[PDB]
Amino acid sequence: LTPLTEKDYEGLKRVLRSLQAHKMAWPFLEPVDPNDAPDYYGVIKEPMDLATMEERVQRRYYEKLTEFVADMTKIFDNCRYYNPSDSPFYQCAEVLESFFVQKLKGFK
């Protein structure tokens, strides 16, 4: 797989901002606050959130699109793992993952 270029990085930033602007992105903007989920960091092995992704994109952490997609997928899979399926959080992960898959298809 090819490395990310500076042009690819403009696309990553675009996709990240589209997610951050979505009405269902509210649970994911910042790292989970342990005061909202006291055992979260003992249960979730690899926490992730959109702010952490934004720091990584700004620092050109990702070498390949697969690593960016893996981090995004952690956001959604962690939320569905920690929360019950009837929670507003679980719903937000399902809607925002579908939106991310629509945007990702753009990269080809």
Binding site: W26, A37, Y82, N83, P84, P88, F89
Partner: peptide, 6 residues
């Protein structure tokens, strides 16, 4: 594990 309400 139940998260705090928004």
């Amino acid at each position: 594990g139940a998260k705090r309400h928004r």
